UniProtKB/Swiss-Prot annotation:
Native organism: Enterococcus faecalis
Descriptive protein name: Transposase from transposon Tn916
Family, per entry: Belongs to the 'phage' integrase family.
Gene: Int-Tn
Covered range of the whole protein: 3 to 71 of 405
Length: 69
DNA sequence: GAGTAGTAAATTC
DNA sequence: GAATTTACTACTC
């Protein structure tokens, strides 16, 4: 009934979590084909499993798509 | 449009 | 020195 994270936090539509537990944000772009955006942190404050690469939380990537990239 | 599973390729501590 | 991540589609509701 609702998309939950790998713990107990509620994710917003469009967002979810791959199979590795990382966050994923799929969205139909103006091209006519879904777009994959990867991220381990839902916000730029959490952390990331050791061995994983660093990146701005999906909320920061998304903010670029909604603002003006 | 929303999300999943599987993969092809390249990269990293 | 080995193990891991990314990208798109295909199918589904």
């Amino acid at each position: 009934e609702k998309r939950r994270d790998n713990r107990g936090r509620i994710l917003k539509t469009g967002e979810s979590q791959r199979k590795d537990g990382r966050y994923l944000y799929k969205y139909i772009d103006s091209f006519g084909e879904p777009q994959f955006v990867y991220s381990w942190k839902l916000v730029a404050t959490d952390r990331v499993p050791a061995g994983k690469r660093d990146a701005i939380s999906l909320r920061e990537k998304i903010a670029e798509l909604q603002k003006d990239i």
